[PDB]
Structures are given as C-alpha cells and as structure tokens.
Coordinates of C-alpha atoms and ligand atoms in Angstrom, one line a residue:
Chain G
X1 CA 13.4 -34.0 5.3
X2 CA 15.2 -31.1 3.5
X3 CA 16.4 -31.0 -0.2
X4 CA 19.1 -28.4 -1.4
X5 CA 17.1 -25.3 -0.6
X6 CA 18.3 -23.9 -3.7
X7 CA 16.4 -20.5 -3.5
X8 CA 19.4 -17.9 -3.5
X9 CA 21.9 -16.4 -5.8
Chain L
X1 CA 7.7 -13.4 -25.4
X2 CA 11.6 -12.8 -25.0
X3 CA 12.5 -13.5 -28.7
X4 CA 13.1 -9.7 -29.1
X5 CA 15.5 -8.9 -26.0
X6 CA 19.2 -9.6 -26.1
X7 CA 20.4 -12.7 -24.4
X8 CA 22.7 -10.3 -22.2
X9 CA 19.7 -8.3 -21.3
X10 CA 17.5 -11.1 -20.2
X11 CA 20.7 -12.5 -17.7
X12 CA 20.8 -9.1 -16.5
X13 CA 17.1 -8.5 -15.8
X14 CA 17.2 -12.0 -14.5
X15 CA 19.8 -11.0 -12.0
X16 CA 17.3 -7.8 -11.1
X17 CA 14.6 -9.9 -10.6
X18 CA 16.3 -11.9 -8.1
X19 CA 17.1 -8.7 -6.0
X20 CA 13.6 -7.8 -6.4
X21 CA 12.4 -11.2 -5.3
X22 CA 10.3 -11.5 -8.6
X23 CA 10.9 -15.2 -9.3
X24 CA 8.2 -15.4 -11.8
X25 CA 9.9 -12.8 -13.9
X26 CA 13.5 -14.2 -13.2
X27 CA 12.2 -17.4 -14.4
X28 CA 10.7 -16.0 -17.5
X29 CA 13.9 -14.2 -18.4
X30 CA 15.9 -17.4 -17.9
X31 CA 13.6 -19.2 -20.4
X32 CA 14.4 -16.5 -22.7
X33 CA 18.0 -16.7 -22.3
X34 CA 17.9 -20.5 -22.7
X35 CA 15.9 -20.5 -25.9
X36 CA 18.6 -18.0 -27.2
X37 CA 20.1 -21.5 -28.0
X38 CA 23.5 -21.0 -26.8
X39 CA 24.8 -23.2 -23.7
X40 CA 24.5 -21.5 -20.1
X41 CA 27.8 -20.9 -18.4
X42 CA 27.9 -21.9 -14.4
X43 CA 26.5 -18.7 -13.3
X44 CA 23.8 -18.6 -15.8
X45 CA 22.8 -22.2 -14.9
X46 CA 22.5 -21.2 -11.2
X47 CA 20.5 -18.1 -12.2
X48 CA 18.0 -20.6 -14.2
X49 CA 17.9 -23.1 -11.2
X50 CA 17.3 -20.5 -8.5
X51 CA 14.2 -19.0 -10.6
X52 CA 12.4 -22.1 -11.1
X53 CA 13.2 -23.3 -7.7
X54 CA 11.5 -20.4 -6.4
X55 CA 8.3 -20.6 -8.5
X56 CA 7.7 -24.2 -8.1
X57 CA 8.6 -24.0 -4.4
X58 CA 5.9 -21.6 -3.8
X59 CA 3.5 -23.7 -5.8
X60 CA 4.5 -26.9 -4.0
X61 CA 3.7 -25.2 -0.8
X62 CA 0.4 -23.9 -1.8
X63 CA -0.4 -27.5 -3.0
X64 CA 0.5 -28.9 0.3
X65 CA -1.5 -26.5 2.4
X66 CA -4.8 -27.2 -0.2
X67 CA -4.2 -30.8 0.0
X68 CA -4.2 -31.0 3.7
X69 CA -7.5 -28.9 3.6
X70 CA -8.8 -31.4 0.9
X71 CA -7.9 -34.5 3.3
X72 CA -9.7 -33.1 6.5
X73 CA -12.9 -32.4 4.5
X74 CA -12.9 -36.1 3.4
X75 CA -18.7 -28.5 -2.1
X76 CA -16.3 -28.9 -4.7
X77 CA -14.3 -25.8 -4.3
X78 CA -11.5 -27.0 -2.4
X79 CA -10.7 -30.0 -4.9
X80 CA -11.3 -27.7 -7.7
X81 CA -8.6 -24.9 -6.3
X82 CA -6.3 -27.8 -5.1
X83 CA -6.4 -29.0 -8.9
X84 CA -5.9 -25.7 -10.5
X85 CA -2.7 -25.0 -8.3
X86 CA -1.4 -28.7 -9.2
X87 CA -2.1 -28.1 -12.9
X88 CA -0.1 -24.7 -12.7
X89 CA 2.5 -26.5 -10.9
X90 CA 2.5 -29.5 -13.6
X91 CA 2.9 -26.9 -16.2
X92 CA 6.1 -25.3 -14.7
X93 CA 8.0 -28.8 -14.1
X94 CA 6.7 -29.4 -18.0
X95 CA 8.6 -26.1 -19.0
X96 CA 11.7 -26.7 -17.1
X97 CA 11.7 -30.5 -18.2
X98 CA 11.3 -29.3 -21.8
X99 CA 14.2 -26.8 -21.6
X100 CA 16.4 -29.6 -20.2
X101 CA 15.2 -31.7 -23.1
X102 CA 15.6 -29.1 -25.7
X103 CA 18.3 -28.8 -25.9
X104 CA 20.3 -28.1 -22.9
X105 CA 21.1 -31.7 -21.8
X106 CA 22.0 -32.9 -25.3
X107 CA 24.8 -30.2 -25.8
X108 CA 26.1 -30.5 -22.0
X109 CA 29.3 -32.4 -22.5
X110 CA 31.2 -31.5 -19.1
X111 CA 30.7 -33.2 -16.0
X112 CA 29.8 -30.2 -14.3
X113 CA 27.1 -28.9 -16.7
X114 CA 25.9 -32.5 -17.4
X115 CA 25.4 -33.3 -13.8
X116 CA 23.8 -29.9 -12.8
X117 CA 21.2 -30.6 -15.8
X118 CA 20.4 -34.3 -14.8
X119 CA 20.1 -33.4 -11.3
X120 CA 17.4 -30.7 -12.2
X121 CA 15.6 -33.5 -14.4
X122 CA 15.4 -35.8 -11.3
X123 CA 14.3 -32.7 -9.2
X124 CA 11.5 -31.9 -11.3
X125 CA 10.3 -35.3 -12.3
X126 CA 10.4 -35.7 -8.3
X127 CA 7.8 -32.5 -8.2
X128 CA 5.7 -34.1 -10.6
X129 CA 5.7 -37.4 -8.6
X130 CA 5.0 -35.4 -5.2
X131 CA 1.4 -35.1 -6.8
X132 CA 1.2 -37.8 -9.3
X133 CA -1.8 -40.3 -8.3
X134 CA -3.1 -42.0 -11.5
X135 CA -1.5 -44.6 -13.8
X136 CA 1.7 -42.5 -14.7
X137 CA 3.0 -42.1 -11.0
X138 CA 5.0 -45.2 -11.5
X139 CA 6.6 -43.7 -14.8
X140 CA 7.3 -40.6 -13.4
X141 CA 9.1 -41.9 -10.5
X142 CA 11.3 -44.1 -12.6
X143 CA 12.2 -41.1 -14.6
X144 CA 13.2 -39.5 -11.8
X145 CA 15.1 -42.4 -10.6
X146 CA 16.7 -42.6 -14.2
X147 CA 17.8 -39.2 -14.2
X148 CA 19.2 -39.0 -10.7
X149 CA 21.3 -42.4 -11.3
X150 CA 22.8 -41.0 -14.7
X151 CA 24.1 -37.8 -12.8
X152 CA 25.3 -40.2 -9.8
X153 CA 27.1 -42.3 -12.1
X154 CA 29.1 -39.2 -13.9
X155 CA 29.7 -37.2 -10.7
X156 CA 31.3 -40.6 -9.2
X157 CA 33.6 -41.0 -12.0
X158 CA 34.2 -37.1 -12.7
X159 CA 33.8 -35.3 -9.5
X160 CA 35.8 -35.2 -6.1
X161 CA 33.7 -36.5 -3.2
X162 CA 33.4 -32.9 -1.8
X163 CA 32.2 -31.2 -5.0
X164 CA 29.1 -29.0 -4.1
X165 CA 27.0 -30.3 -7.1
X166 CA 27.9 -33.8 -6.5
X167 CA 26.9 -33.5 -3.0
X168 CA 23.5 -31.7 -3.6
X169 CA 22.8 -34.1 -6.3
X170 CA 23.1 -37.0 -3.5
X171 CA 21.5 -35.1 -0.9
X172 CA 18.6 -34.9 -3.2
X173 CA 18.7 -38.3 -4.6
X174 CA 18.5 -39.5 -0.9
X175 CA 15.5 -37.5 -0.3
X176 CA 13.9 -39.1 -3.5
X177 CA 14.6 -42.6 -2.1
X178 CA 13.2 -41.4 1.5
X179 CA 10.0 -39.5 0.3
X180 CA 9.1 -40.7 -3.1
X181 CA 10.6 -44.2 -3.6
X182 CA 9.6 -45.6 -0.3
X183 CA 13.4 -46.7 0.5
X184 CA 14.3 -44.8 3.6
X185 CA 17.2 -47.4 4.2
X186 CA 18.8 -46.7 0.8
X187 CA 18.2 -42.9 1.6
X188 CA 20.1 -43.4 4.8
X189 CA 23.0 -45.3 3.4
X190 CA 23.5 -42.9 0.6
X191 CA 23.4 -39.8 3.0
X192 CA 25.9 -41.7 5.2
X193 CA 28.2 -42.9 2.3
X194 CA 28.1 -39.3 0.8
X195 CA 29.0 -37.6 4.2
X196 CA 32.0 -40.1 5.0
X197 CA 33.6 -39.7 1.8
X198 CA 33.4 -36.0 1.7
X199 CA 34.5 -35.9 5.3
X200 CA 37.6 -37.7 4.0
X201 CA 38.3 -35.3 1.3
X202 CA 38.2 -32.1 3.0
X203 CA 41.8 -31.9 3.8
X204 CA 42.3 -31.1 -0.1
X205 CA 40.2 -27.8 0.0
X206 CA 41.1 -24.2 0.6
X207 CA 39.1 -22.6 3.3
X208 CA 36.6 -21.2 0.7
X209 CA 35.7 -24.6 -1.0
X210 CA 35.8 -26.4 2.8
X211 CA 32.8 -23.6 3.6
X212 CA 31.0 -24.5 0.4
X213 CA 31.1 -28.3 1.0
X214 CA 30.7 -28.5 4.7
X215 CA 27.4 -26.5 4.3
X216 CA 26.1 -29.4 2.3
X217 CA 27.3 -32.1 4.3
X218 CA 25.4 -30.6 7.3
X219 CA 22.3 -30.7 5.3
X220 CA 23.1 -34.7 4.8
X221 CA 23.6 -34.7 8.5
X222 CA 20.1 -33.0 9.2
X223 CA 18.4 -35.5 7.2
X224 CA 20.2 -38.3 9.0
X225 CA 19.2 -37.0 12.4
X226 CA 15.7 -36.7 11.1
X227 CA 15.9 -40.4 9.7
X228 CA 17.5 -42.3 12.2
Chain S
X1 CA -12.8 -15.0 -16.1
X2 CA -14.7 -15.5 -12.8
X3 CA -17.9 -14.8 -14.6
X4 CA -19.0 -18.6 -14.6
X5 CA -18.1 -19.1 -10.9
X6 CA -20.7 -18.8 -8.2
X7 CA -20.3 -15.4 -5.8
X8 CA -20.3 -18.1 -2.9
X9 CA -17.4 -20.1 -4.6
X10 CA -15.4 -17.3 -5.4
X11 CA -15.4 -16.1 -1.6
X12 CA -14.8 -19.7 -0.6
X13 CA -11.6 -19.8 -2.8
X14 CA -10.5 -16.5 -1.6
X15 CA -10.4 -17.8 1.8
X16 CA -8.3 -20.8 0.5
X17 CA -5.9 -18.9 -1.4
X18 CA -5.3 -16.7 1.8
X19 CA -4.2 -19.9 3.5
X20 CA -1.9 -21.0 0.5
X21 CA -0.5 -17.4 0.4
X22 CA -1.6 -17.2 -3.2
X23 CA -2.4 -13.5 -3.1
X24 CA -2.8 -12.9 -6.7
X25 CA -5.5 -15.7 -7.1
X26 CA -7.2 -14.3 -3.8
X27 CA -7.4 -10.8 -5.4
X28 CA -8.6 -12.4 -8.7
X29 CA -11.3 -14.3 -6.8
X30 CA -12.4 -11.2 -4.7
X31 CA -12.4 -9.0 -8.3
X32 CA -15.0 -11.6 -9.4
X33 CA -16.9 -11.3 -6.2
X34 CA -17.2 -7.6 -6.4
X35 CA -18.2 -7.8 -10.1
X36 CA -21.2 -10.2 -9.2
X37 CA -22.7 -6.7 -8.6
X38 CA -24.0 -7.3 -4.8
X39 CA -22.6 -5.2 -1.7
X40 CA -19.6 -6.8 0.1
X41 CA -20.0 -7.8 3.8
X42 CA -17.6 -6.7 6.6
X43 CA -15.7 -9.9 6.2
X44 CA -15.7 -9.8 2.3
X45 CA -14.4 -6.2 2.4
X46 CA -11.6 -7.5 4.4
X47 CA -10.8 -10.4 2.1
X48 CA -10.9 -7.8 -0.8
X49 CA -8.5 -5.6 1.0
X50 CA -6.0 -8.3 2.2
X51 CA -5.8 -9.7 -1.2
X52 CA -4.9 -6.5 -2.8
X53 CA -2.8 -5.1 -0.1
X54 CA -0.5 -8.1 -0.7
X55 CA -0.4 -8.1 -4.3
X56 CA 0.6 -4.5 -4.3
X57 CA 2.6 -4.7 -1.5
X58 CA 4.9 -7.2 -3.3
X59 CA 5.0 -5.0 -6.3
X60 CA 5.9 -1.8 -4.2
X61 CA 8.6 -3.6 -2.4
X62 CA 10.2 -4.7 -5.9
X63 CA 9.7 -1.1 -7.1
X64 CA 11.7 0.4 -4.5
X65 CA 14.6 -2.3 -4.8
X66 CA 15.0 -1.6 -8.7
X67 CA 14.4 2.1 -8.2
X68 CA 17.3 2.2 -5.6
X69 CA 19.4 0.4 -8.1
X70 CA 18.5 2.6 -10.8
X71 CA 19.3 5.6 -8.8
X72 CA 22.7 4.1 -7.8
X73 CA 23.5 4.2 -11.6
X74 CA 22.9 7.6 -12.2
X75 CA 22.6 -0.1 -20.2
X76 CA 18.9 0.7 -20.1
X77 CA 18.0 -2.7 -18.5
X78 CA 17.2 -1.4 -14.8
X79 CA 15.3 1.5 -16.0
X80 CA 13.2 -1.1 -18.5
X81 CA 12.7 -3.4 -15.7
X82 CA 11.7 -0.7 -13.2
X83 CA 9.5 0.5 -15.8
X84 CA 7.7 -2.6 -16.4
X85 CA 7.1 -3.3 -12.6
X86 CA 5.9 0.5 -12.2
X87 CA 3.3 -0.1 -14.8
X88 CA 2.3 -3.6 -13.6
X89 CA 1.7 -1.7 -10.0
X90 CA 0.0 1.0 -11.8
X91 CA -2.5 -1.4 -13.4
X92 CA -3.4 -3.2 -10.3
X93 CA -4.3 0.3 -8.4
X94 CA -6.3 1.1 -11.4
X95 CA -8.1 -2.1 -11.3
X96 CA -8.8 -1.6 -7.4
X97 CA -9.6 2.1 -8.0
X98 CA -12.3 0.8 -10.9
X99 CA -13.8 -1.8 -8.5
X100 CA -14.4 1.3 -6.0
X101 CA -15.8 3.4 -8.7
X102 CA -18.0 0.7 -10.4
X103 CA -19.8 0.5 -8.1
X104 CA -18.7 -0.2 -4.3
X105 CA -18.4 3.4 -3.0
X106 CA -21.7 4.7 -4.8
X107 CA -23.7 1.7 -3.0
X108 CA -21.9 1.9 0.2
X109 CA -24.5 3.9 2.8
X110 CA -23.3 2.6 6.3
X111 CA -20.5 4.5 7.6
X112 CA -18.4 1.2 8.2
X113 CA -18.6 0.2 4.6
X114 CA -18.3 3.7 3.2
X115 CA -15.3 4.7 5.4
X116 CA -13.6 1.4 4.4
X117 CA -13.9 1.9 0.8
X118 CA -12.8 5.8 0.8
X119 CA -9.9 4.9 3.0
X120 CA -9.0 2.5 0.2
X121 CA -9.4 4.8 -2.3
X122 CA -7.0 7.0 -0.6
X123 CA -4.7 4.3 -0.1
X124 CA -4.4 3.1 -4.0
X125 CA -4.0 6.8 -5.0
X126 CA -1.0 6.9 -2.5
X127 CA 0.6 3.8 -4.1
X128 CA -0.1 5.7 -7.3
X129 CA 1.8 9.1 -6.1
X130 CA 4.7 7.0 -4.6
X131 CA 5.6 6.3 -8.2
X132 CA 4.5 9.0 -9.9
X133 CA 6.7 11.8 -11.4
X134 CA 5.1 13.7 -14.5
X135 CA 2.4 16.3 -14.8
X136 CA -0.4 14.2 -13.0
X137 CA 1.4 13.9 -9.7
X138 CA -0.1 16.7 -8.2
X139 CA -3.6 15.5 -9.2
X140 CA -3.2 12.0 -8.0
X141 CA -2.1 13.4 -4.6
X142 CA -5.1 15.5 -4.7
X143 CA -7.3 12.4 -5.2
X144 CA -5.8 10.7 -2.8
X145 CA -6.1 13.7 -0.2
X146 CA -9.6 14.3 -1.0
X147 CA -10.6 10.4 -0.3
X148 CA -8.9 10.3 2.8
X149 CA -10.4 13.7 4.0
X150 CA -14.1 12.6 3.2
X151 CA -13.5 9.5 4.8
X152 CA -12.2 11.3 7.9
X153 CA -15.3 13.5 7.9
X154 CA -17.6 10.7 7.8
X155 CA -15.8 8.7 10.7
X156 CA -15.5 11.6 13.1
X157 CA -19.2 11.9 12.9
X158 CA -20.5 8.4 12.7
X159 CA -17.7 6.2 14.6
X160 CA -16.2 6.2 18.0
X161 CA -12.5 7.4 18.6
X162 CA -11.6 3.8 19.2
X163 CA -13.0 2.4 15.9
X164 CA -10.6 0.2 14.5
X165 CA -11.2 1.3 11.1
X166 CA -11.6 5.1 12.0
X167 CA -8.0 4.6 13.7
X168 CA -6.3 2.7 10.6
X169 CA -7.6 5.6 8.4
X170 CA -6.1 8.3 10.7
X171 CA -2.8 6.1 10.7
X172 CA -2.6 6.2 6.8
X173 CA -3.7 9.4 6.3
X174 CA -0.8 10.6 8.7
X175 CA 1.3 8.4 6.9
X176 CA 0.1 10.3 3.5
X177 CA 0.9 13.7 5.1
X178 CA 4.4 12.6 6.1
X179 CA 5.5 10.5 3.2
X180 CA 3.4 12.0 0.3
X181 CA 2.3 15.5 1.1
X182 CA 5.5 17.0 2.7
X183 CA 3.6 18.0 5.7
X184 CA 5.2 16.1 8.7
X185 CA 3.7 18.6 11.3
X186 CA 0.2 17.8 9.9
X187 CA 1.3 14.1 10.1
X188 CA 2.3 14.3 13.6
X189 CA -0.7 16.2 15.1
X190 CA -2.8 14.0 13.4
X191 CA -1.6 11.2 15.0
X192 CA -1.3 12.6 18.3
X193 CA -4.8 13.7 18.4
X194 CA -5.9 10.3 17.0
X195 CA -4.4 8.6 19.8
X196 CA -5.2 10.9 22.6
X197 CA -8.9 10.8 21.6
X198 CA -8.9 6.8 21.4
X199 CA -6.9 6.7 24.7
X200 CA -9.6 8.7 26.5
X201 CA -12.5 6.2 24.9
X202 CA -10.7 2.9 25.8
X203 CA -12.7 2.6 29.2
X204 CA -15.8 2.2 27.0
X205 CA -14.6 -1.1 25.2
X206 CA -15.0 -4.7 26.1
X207 CA -11.5 -7.0 26.5
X208 CA -11.7 -7.8 22.9
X209 CA -12.6 -4.5 21.4
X210 CA -9.6 -3.0 23.7
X211 CA -7.0 -5.3 22.3
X212 CA -8.4 -4.4 18.6
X213 CA -8.0 -0.7 19.1
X214 CA -4.7 -0.6 21.5
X215 CA -3.0 -2.7 18.5
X216 CA -3.6 0.3 16.1
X217 CA -3.0 3.0 18.8
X218 CA 0.4 1.2 19.2
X219 CA 1.0 1.7 15.2
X220 CA 0.3 5.2 15.7
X221 CA 2.9 5.5 18.7
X222 CA 5.5 4.0 16.4
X223 CA 5.3 6.2 13.9
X224 CA 5.3 9.2 16.4
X225 CA 8.7 7.8 18.2
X226 CA 10.3 7.8 14.6
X227 CA 8.9 11.1 13.7
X228 CA 9.9 13.1 16.8
Chain W
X1 CA 6.9 5.1 9.0
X2 CA 4.1 2.2 8.8
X3 CA 0.8 2.4 7.4
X4 CA -1.6 -0.5 8.2
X5 CA 0.3 -3.5 7.5
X6 CA -3.2 -5.1 6.2
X7 CA -2.0 -8.2 4.9
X8 CA -3.6 -11.0 7.2
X9 CA -7.1 -12.2 7.7
Ligands
V4B1 C1 22.1 -28.9 -6.5 C2 22.9 -28.0 -5.5 C3 24.2 -28.2 -5.2 C4 24.9 -27.4 -4.4 C5 24.4 -26.2 -4.1 N1 25.2 -25.2 -3.3 O1 24.4 -24.6 -2.2 O2 26.2 -25.1 -3.6 C6 23.2 -25.6 -4.4 O3 22.4 -24.4 -4.3 C7 22.8 -23.2 -4.5 O4 22.1 -23.2 -5.7 C8 23.0 -22.2 -3.5 C9 24.3 -22.2 -3.8 C10 24.7 -21.0 -2.5 C11 23.8 -20.5 -1.8 C12 24.6 -19.6 -0.8 F1 23.6 -18.5 -0.7 F2 24.8 -20.2 0.2 F3 25.5 -18.9 -1.4 N2 22.6 -20.6 -1.9 C13 22.4 -21.4 -2.7 C14 20.9 -21.5 -2.9 C15 22.3 -26.7 -5.2
V4B2 C1 -7.9 0.2 7.4 C2 -7.4 -1.0 8.6 C3 -8.1 -0.6 9.9 C4 -8.1 -1.6 11.0 C5 -7.3 -2.8 10.8 N1 -7.1 -3.7 11.8 O1 -6.1 -4.3 11.9 O2 -8.2 -3.7 12.6 C6 -6.9 -3.1 9.3 O3 -6.0 -4.2 8.7 C7 -6.5 -5.5 8.9 O4 -7.3 -5.8 7.6 C8 -6.2 -6.4 10.0 C9 -7.0 -6.8 10.7 C10 -6.7 -7.6 12.0 C11 -5.6 -8.4 11.6 C12 -5.0 -9.2 12.7 F1 -4.2 -10.4 12.3 F2 -4.5 -8.9 13.7 F3 -6.0 -10.0 13.3 N2 -4.8 -8.5 10.8 C13 -5.0 -7.6 9.8 C14 -4.0 -7.2 8.8 C15 -6.9 -2.2 8.2
CA3 CA1 21.8 -10.9 -29.9
CA4 CA1 -25.4 -17.3 -8.6
CL5 CL1 -10.6 -22.8 -8.8
CL6 CL1 28.9 -28.8 -25.5
CL7 CL1 11.8 -5.4 -18.8
CL8 CL1 -26.3 0.3 0.2

C-alpha cells in the first residue's frame, strides 16, 4: 500500500 | 551547524538542495531554519517535509533490503549492518519528532499548520514502528495512533473534505491501520469514507484545486483496489 | 573508522551496501578494506570502483545543477552552495587518489590490476578537472592525461583488443579528449580505432566474453554517433 | 558523451 509519496516540491 | 547562517539563506539553500537532489543537505538546512525559532510558512513546512521524507525514505528502503537478506539467512555481518542502518533511521525519526516537539506543534494554532505537524508526528512514529520489535513497539504504535487521531479530529472540524492535507492525513492513517495496527477493516473503511466524502465536495473546487484533490483521491482508490 | 573490523567483514558489508544502494557506506567499507594493506582481487577492485563511482556521480550531478543555476544568475547563496558541493567532490576525488597512491598502484604488478588502477587515477583527475578553474587546472589535466597514457601503453602491450578493461579505458580516455582536453579529433580517432580493432578480435571470444566486449563497443559507437 | 557508467556490480 502507498502512503503519500511526499518526495517532491 | 547552521546557527551562523541567515534563516532566509537556509531556506534558499534548501530549495537549491532539492533541485540538486541533495536531500541530506536539504534536511540539515531546514532543521537549521526550524531552529531559528520562528513559525514556518506553508511553503516552508512542505520543504521540511519533503527533505526528511526523502532522507528517511532511502533509509527505509535500505532497511527493508537488509531485513529481507537477514530473514533469508535465518556471520554477524548482515545483522550488524541492518542494526546500523536501523539506528541511523531511528536517529532521523527522533530528530524530526524533536523538531515537532520543540517547538513546532505547540506554536501551531491554525488548522493547516497544526494538522500538518500532527500528521508528520504520526508518520515518523509510524516509521519507528516499522522497525520496532522490543518492549516499546506497542507504545510507539500508540504514539502514532494518538498523533494521527488528534490530526483527524481537527481536520474533520476545520477543513473541507477535499482539503489535500486532510486527504493525505486520512490516506496515511489508513496505511497505519493496514500495515502497522493490523486493522485492515478500519483501513478500508477510512479510505472509502474519505474518498466518498471528497467526491461529494469536488463540485465546490476550482480547476486547480480539483486536480490537487483528485490526485490524492486516486491514491486512496489505488489502496482500496489493493486491499479488496 | 574501519580499523577494528575484519577485512572479510568489510568486503561482505560493501556487497550488502551495494544491494541496499547505500553507496557512501559501500565506499567507506572498501576504503577500510584497502587500508588493511593487502592487494585487492578482481572482484574487490570492482567493488571499490563501483562504490566511489556512485558517490562521485551524485556529487557531479549536483555540481552541474548548481553550476547551471549559478551561470543563469550571472545573493551569495548559489555560489556558496556550489562551492560546498565542489569542495566535497574534491575531497572524495582526493581520497580515491590517495588510496591509489598509498599504495594500490605501486603494488599492482599484473596488467589487469595496474591498468585498472591507472584508469581509475585518470578518471578521478578528470573529475577534478571538470570543476577546476584556477592556476592548477592545466596541471590537473596533465595528471589525468599522464595516468590514462600509462594505462593505454600497458593495455596495448599486455591485453587483447577486446579486453573489457582495455575497452573501457579507451572509452574514458576518448571522453577525456573530447570533454576535457578540447581534442575532439583525437577523441574520435581513438574511439574508431578502438572499435575497429575490437571488432576484428571478436571471433576469438566465447559467448560470454563476446557479450562483455560488444556491450562496451556499443558505448564507443554511441559516442561516435554523437560526435560525428 | 558517455564514459563507462560503472555504477553496478
Ligand atoms: C500529507 C500530504 C498531503 C497532501 C500532499 N499533496 O500532494 O498535496 C502531500 O504531498 C506533497 O508534499 C506533494 C504535493 C504536491 C506534489 C506535486 F509534485 F504533485 F506537485 N508533490 C508532493 C510530494 C502530502
Ligand atoms: C573501466 C571499466 C571497464 C569495463 C567495465 N565493464 O562493464 O566491463 C566497467 O564497468 C563496470 O564496472 C561494470 C561491469 C559490468 C556491469 C554489468 F552490470 F553489466 F554487469 N556493470 C558495470 C557497471 C568499467
Ligand atoms: Ca537573521
Ligand atoms: Ca584480520
Ligand atoms: Cl556495520
Ligand atoms: Cl502561532
Ligand atoms: Cl552552503
Ligand atoms: Cl603485487
């Protein structure tokens, strides 16, 4: 399952 | 190590480090910016989050690779190296949690800042819980749950159902339920209710806000597809 | 910091770090292994090379991003941060060059180890030359050229034209000519002659060696396509 | 132009 990717901007 | 650099210079260098994909630098710059003592803007909060998300994300990926090799083996090298990475990951999580506790959360009065930080607190306790095995794994899980729950309570009272921070909080809390708390039914119910209430609120949004919200709703739908 | 760990444990952890994509760890482990004082095997040389190639590769990528932003701007922040990354890159190159000089190269007597290290020496002087601007840029370029040239001389005398180390040396020396030395005609001539002499030697190879050599010949052809 | 990638194995 995916959490918020959260790695850009 | 950033005490002698201007707050504005730390923020500008954090933006440069993101462009250079130097996320350890980015995290150190934003740690320095937080330690100036001033509250963070919306943009600045996102820089803090992106920096540490990338740092801990590389550590989590490495820990999973090493943990998988270690389980297949069951010399001390694999265990020793997994422990080293695990300790480094725990230090990063402790650093983020320390920034939230000193003193980002207590000075966050608006819903959008307070929910953002409490979601962060839940996330980094969740990362600690992923590697926890001793007598404190239960307490770490409850710390994650408590932070997520307070954030949920505020977001339901103070934000529309399409607010991207509210949606991402519910997404990650649902992942907490499924992956950490062994509550897949709670995970599915939260994701469905979150998606359905956002869908009914989309008619209120501009074209740009619509794109922001539907992107996160797709992540909720992706998880539901995997879970059902 | 690796003086207390067994050589074999350092090598095993370097392999683990590569699987975890923890290349800074990988480089530190192999630096420790080199500093045990024993010569390195073929496999161990490649671990050393892969570790530092990844570390310096991330630094070079970041330096180019920051240098491009800096040129577009022409506060001190962009220049300051580019200088910091540049200094960190130079330290990594100096560390690798120091390992080669103390004492990998002087103890390397076989063609395959000696050519490998001299190619490495040319590569890391080339990386220093990419960022050099002062009164030593000419001397750095000549240091790269001299290392590559000695490696070339040995490889032509001691290796078949399809040897992957010989092919990769000629590839990188050709890139040196094109990108560093402002000698595109020498770059093209070396790449063509290298490719043609390898092509004529392919009939001698096994299926596995054929695949190894043709992979690098394709890189030579890719550069020629770009350069002509 | 590409040098030896050199980042795997
Ligand atoms: C907790 C949280 C809530 C919402 C969002 N969000 O995407 O809106 C995020 O993640 C981000 O920080 C974010 C936002 C936007 C983008 C963009 F590239 F699509 F513009 N990326 C990210 C990573 C977190
Ligand atoms: C200087 C040099 C010469 C040859 C080669 N080579 O690929 O043979 C290299 O690069 C490597 O170290 C290497 C070898 C093989 C592979 C593989 F993934 F294709 F197996 N990758 C790399 C990076 C350097
Ligand atoms: Ca100031
Ligand atoms: Ca020993
Ligand atoms: Cl270790
Ligand atoms: Cl406040
Ligand atoms: Cl700086
Ligand atoms: Cl020897």
